Design a protein around this nucleic acid. Sequence first.
DNA 1: GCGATCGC
DNA 2: GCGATCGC
Length: 56
Amino acid sequence: MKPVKVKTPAGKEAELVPEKVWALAPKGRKGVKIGLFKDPETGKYFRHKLPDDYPI
DNA sequence: GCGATCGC
DNA sequence: GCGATCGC
């Protein structure tokens, strides 16, 4: 899986590979894609939106 | 609240 | 079982 440019909860921009990705959309609607990331410095897990074209 | 996911 | 993730 490709790295994603995200802002971490610590407030830093990092290109990180997500541990898990999935589509989050109500039925019949466009939604978003979410990834689960781990902050490389604090170990804290966080979710973040993925680009709309990111492979699920 | 909906939608899924999972760390806590 | 809740918070947190987006955009309605």
